[PDB]
PDB file of C-alpha atoms in Angstrom:
ATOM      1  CA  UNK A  18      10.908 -10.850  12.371  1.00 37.47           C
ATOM      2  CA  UNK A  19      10.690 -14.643  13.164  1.00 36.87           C
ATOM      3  CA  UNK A  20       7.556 -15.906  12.037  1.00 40.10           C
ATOM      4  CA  UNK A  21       4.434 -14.482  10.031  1.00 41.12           C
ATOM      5  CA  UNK A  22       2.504 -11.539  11.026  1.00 41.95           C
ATOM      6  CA  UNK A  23      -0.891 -10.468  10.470  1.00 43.70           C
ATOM      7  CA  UNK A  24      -1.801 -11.460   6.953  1.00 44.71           C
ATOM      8  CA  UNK A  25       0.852 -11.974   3.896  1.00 44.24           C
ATOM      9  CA  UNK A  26       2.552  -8.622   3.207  1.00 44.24           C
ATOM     10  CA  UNK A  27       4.490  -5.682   4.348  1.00 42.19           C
ATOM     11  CA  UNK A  28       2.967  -3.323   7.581  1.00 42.55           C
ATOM     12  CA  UNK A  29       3.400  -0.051   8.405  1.00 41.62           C
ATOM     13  CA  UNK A  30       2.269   3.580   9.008  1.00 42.64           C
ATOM     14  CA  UNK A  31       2.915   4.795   5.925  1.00 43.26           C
ATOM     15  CA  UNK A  32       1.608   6.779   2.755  1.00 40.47           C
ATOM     16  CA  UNK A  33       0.441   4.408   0.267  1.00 38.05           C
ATOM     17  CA  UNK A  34      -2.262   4.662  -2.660  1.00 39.37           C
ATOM     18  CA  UNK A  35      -4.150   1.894  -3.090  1.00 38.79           C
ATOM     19  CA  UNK A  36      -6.192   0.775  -6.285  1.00 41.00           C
ATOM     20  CA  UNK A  37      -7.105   3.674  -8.615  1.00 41.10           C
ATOM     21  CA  UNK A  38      -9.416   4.605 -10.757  1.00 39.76           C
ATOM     22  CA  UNK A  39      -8.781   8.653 -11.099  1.00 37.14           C
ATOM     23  CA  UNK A  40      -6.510  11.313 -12.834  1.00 38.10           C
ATOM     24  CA  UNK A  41      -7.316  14.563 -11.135  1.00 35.81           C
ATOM     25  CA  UNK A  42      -4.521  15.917 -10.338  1.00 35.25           C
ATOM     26  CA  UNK A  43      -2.920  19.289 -12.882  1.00 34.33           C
ATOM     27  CA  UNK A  44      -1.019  20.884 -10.338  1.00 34.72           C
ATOM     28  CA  UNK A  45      -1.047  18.707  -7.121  1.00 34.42           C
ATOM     29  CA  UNK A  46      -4.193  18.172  -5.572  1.00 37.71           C
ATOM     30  CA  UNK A  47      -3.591  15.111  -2.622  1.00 39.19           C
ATOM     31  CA  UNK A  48      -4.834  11.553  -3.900  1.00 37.39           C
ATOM     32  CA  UNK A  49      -2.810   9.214  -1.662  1.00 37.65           C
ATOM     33  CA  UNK A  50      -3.495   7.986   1.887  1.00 38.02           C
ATOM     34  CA  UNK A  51      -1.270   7.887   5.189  1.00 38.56           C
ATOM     35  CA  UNK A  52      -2.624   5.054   7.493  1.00 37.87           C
ATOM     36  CA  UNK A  53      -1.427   1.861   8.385  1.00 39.82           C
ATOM     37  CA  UNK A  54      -1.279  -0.362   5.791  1.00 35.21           C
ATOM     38  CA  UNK A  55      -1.408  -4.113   5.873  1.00 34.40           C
ATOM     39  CA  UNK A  56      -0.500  -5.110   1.976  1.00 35.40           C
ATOM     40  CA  UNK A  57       1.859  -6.264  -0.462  1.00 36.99           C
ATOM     41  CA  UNK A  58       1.324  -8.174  -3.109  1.00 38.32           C
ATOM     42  CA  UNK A  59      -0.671 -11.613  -2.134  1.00 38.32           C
ATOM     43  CA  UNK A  60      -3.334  -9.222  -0.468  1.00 37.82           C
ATOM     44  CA  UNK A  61      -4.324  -6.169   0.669  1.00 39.06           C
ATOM     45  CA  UNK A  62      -5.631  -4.902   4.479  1.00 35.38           C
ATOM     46  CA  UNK A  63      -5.661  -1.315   5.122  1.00 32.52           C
ATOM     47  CA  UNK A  64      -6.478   0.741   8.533  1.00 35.65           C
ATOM     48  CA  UNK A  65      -6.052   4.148   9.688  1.00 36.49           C
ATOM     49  CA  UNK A  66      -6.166   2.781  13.491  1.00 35.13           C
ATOM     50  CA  UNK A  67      -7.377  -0.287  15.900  1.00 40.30           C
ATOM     51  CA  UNK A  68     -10.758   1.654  15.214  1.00 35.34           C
ATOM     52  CA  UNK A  69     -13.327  -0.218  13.233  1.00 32.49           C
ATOM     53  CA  UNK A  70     -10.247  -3.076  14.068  1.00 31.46           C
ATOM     54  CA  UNK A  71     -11.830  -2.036  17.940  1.00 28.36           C
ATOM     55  CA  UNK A  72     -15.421  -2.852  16.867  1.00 28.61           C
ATOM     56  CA  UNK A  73     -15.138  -5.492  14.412  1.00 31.37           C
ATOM     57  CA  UNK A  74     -12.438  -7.202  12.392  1.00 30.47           C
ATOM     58  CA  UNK A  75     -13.644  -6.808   8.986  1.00 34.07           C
ATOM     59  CA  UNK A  76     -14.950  -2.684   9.504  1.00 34.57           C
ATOM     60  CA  UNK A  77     -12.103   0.038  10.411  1.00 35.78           C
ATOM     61  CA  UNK A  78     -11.799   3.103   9.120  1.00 36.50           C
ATOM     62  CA  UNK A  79     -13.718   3.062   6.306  1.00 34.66           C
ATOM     63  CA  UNK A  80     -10.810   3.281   3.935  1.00 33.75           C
ATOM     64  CA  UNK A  81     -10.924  -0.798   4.674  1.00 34.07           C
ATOM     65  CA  UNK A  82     -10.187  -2.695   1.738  1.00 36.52           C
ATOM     66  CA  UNK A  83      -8.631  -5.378   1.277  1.00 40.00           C
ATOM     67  CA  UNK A  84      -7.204  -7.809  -1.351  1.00 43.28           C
ATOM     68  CA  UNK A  85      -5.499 -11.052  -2.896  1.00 43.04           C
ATOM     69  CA  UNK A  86      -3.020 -10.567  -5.416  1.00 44.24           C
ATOM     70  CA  UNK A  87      -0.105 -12.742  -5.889  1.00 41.89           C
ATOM     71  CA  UNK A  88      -1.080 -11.730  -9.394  1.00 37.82           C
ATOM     72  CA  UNK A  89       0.196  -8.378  -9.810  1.00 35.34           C
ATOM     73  CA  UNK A  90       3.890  -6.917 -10.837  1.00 39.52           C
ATOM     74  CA  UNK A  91       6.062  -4.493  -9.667  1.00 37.08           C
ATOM     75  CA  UNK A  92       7.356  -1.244 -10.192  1.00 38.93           C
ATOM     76  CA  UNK A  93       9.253   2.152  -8.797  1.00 39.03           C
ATOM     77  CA  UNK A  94       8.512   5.709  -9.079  1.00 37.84           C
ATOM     78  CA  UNK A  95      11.880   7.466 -10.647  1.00 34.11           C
ATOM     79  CA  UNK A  96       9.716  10.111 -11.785  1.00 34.69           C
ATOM     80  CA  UNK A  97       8.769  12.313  -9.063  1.00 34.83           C
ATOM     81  CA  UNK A  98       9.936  14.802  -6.313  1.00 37.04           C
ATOM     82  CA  UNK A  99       8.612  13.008  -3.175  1.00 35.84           C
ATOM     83  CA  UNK A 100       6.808  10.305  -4.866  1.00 36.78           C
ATOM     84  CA  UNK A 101      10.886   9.007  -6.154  1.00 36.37           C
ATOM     85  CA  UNK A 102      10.922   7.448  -3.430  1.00 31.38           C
ATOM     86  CA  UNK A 103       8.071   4.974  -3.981  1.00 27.81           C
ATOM     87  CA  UNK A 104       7.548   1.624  -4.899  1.00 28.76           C
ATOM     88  CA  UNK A 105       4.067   0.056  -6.700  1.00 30.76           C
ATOM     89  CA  UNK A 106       2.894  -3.506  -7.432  1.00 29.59           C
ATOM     90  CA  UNK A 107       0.152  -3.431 -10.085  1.00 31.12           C
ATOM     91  CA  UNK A 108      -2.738  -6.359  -9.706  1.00 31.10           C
ATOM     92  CA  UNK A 109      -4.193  -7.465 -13.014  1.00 35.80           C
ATOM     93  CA  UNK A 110      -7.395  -5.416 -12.146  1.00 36.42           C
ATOM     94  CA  UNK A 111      -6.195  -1.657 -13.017  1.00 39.64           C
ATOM     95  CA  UNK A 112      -5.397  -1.025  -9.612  1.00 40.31           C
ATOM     96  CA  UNK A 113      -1.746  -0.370  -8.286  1.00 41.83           C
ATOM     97  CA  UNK A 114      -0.489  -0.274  -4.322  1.00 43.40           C
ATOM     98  CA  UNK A 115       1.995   2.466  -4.028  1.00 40.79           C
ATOM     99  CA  UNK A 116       4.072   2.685  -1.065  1.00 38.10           C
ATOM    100  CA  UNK A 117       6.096   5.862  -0.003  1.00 36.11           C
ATOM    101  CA  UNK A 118       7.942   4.501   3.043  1.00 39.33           C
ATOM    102  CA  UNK A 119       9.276   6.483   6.476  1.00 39.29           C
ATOM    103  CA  UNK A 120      13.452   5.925   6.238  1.00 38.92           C
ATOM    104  CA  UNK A 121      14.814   3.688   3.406  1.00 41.18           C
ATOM    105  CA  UNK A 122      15.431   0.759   4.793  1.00 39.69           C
ATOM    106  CA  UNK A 123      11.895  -0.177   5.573  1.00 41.21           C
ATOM    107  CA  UNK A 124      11.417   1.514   2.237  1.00 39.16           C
ATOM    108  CA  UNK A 125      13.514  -1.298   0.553  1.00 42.14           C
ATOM    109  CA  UNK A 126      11.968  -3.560   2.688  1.00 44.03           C
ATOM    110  CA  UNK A 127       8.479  -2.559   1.252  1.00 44.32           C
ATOM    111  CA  UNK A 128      10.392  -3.606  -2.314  1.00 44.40           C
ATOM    112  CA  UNK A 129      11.798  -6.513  -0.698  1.00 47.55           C
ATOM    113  CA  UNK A 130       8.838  -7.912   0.469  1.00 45.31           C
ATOM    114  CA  UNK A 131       6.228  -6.307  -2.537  1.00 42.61           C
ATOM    115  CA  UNK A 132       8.606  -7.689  -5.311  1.00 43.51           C
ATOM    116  CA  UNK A 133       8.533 -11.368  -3.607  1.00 39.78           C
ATOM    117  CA  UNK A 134       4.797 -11.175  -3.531  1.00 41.81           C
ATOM    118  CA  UNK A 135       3.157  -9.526  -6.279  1.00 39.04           C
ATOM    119  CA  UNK A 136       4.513 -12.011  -9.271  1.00 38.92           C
ATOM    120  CA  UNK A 137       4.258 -15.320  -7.559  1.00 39.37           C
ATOM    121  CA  UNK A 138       4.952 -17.964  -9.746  1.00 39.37           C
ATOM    122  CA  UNK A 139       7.778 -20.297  -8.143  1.00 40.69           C
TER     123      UNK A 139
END
């Protein structure tokens, strides 16, 4: 773009999983989310639509959340069959923000931005 956008991050409609906490999985079982995320790596703001975003600006679709972390790291996938395609930045709070982009260049673009976020130092 030109200038900044919402918050500080990376937006799209895409298929990320934020923070975790779980390990059910064996076979497949779905864990990950596809809404519009607002995140990155200096903080977080998820929403499926303008829906809760239509009511009030802190409520939307109930998978909310939201977060400050130019804290965490940074990491890719290279271990999966759809998920290899993926990039993560990991807070300092167990959680990680995993990103499985639409076409590849937004998809490096998620990396682009998530990698200049996440570690913050200078």
């Amino acid at each position: 773009g030109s200038g900044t956008g919402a918050g500080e991050g990376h937006e799209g409609y895409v298929t990320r999983k934020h923070e975790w906490d779980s390990t059910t999985k064996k076979a497949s079982n779905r864990s990950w989310d596809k809404v519009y995320m607002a995140a990155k790596a200096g903080r977080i703001s998820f929403y499926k639509d303008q829906k809760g975003y239509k009511s009030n600006p802190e409520l939307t679709f109930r998978g909310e959340p939201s977060y400050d972390l130019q804290n965490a790291a940074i990491e890719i996938a290279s271990d999966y069959t759809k998920k290899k395609h993926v990039l993560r930045v990991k807070l300092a709070n167990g959680a990680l923000f995993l990103l499985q982009a639409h076409d590849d260049t937004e998809m490096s673009q998620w990396v682009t931005s998530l990698k200049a976020q996440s570690d913050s130092t200078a």
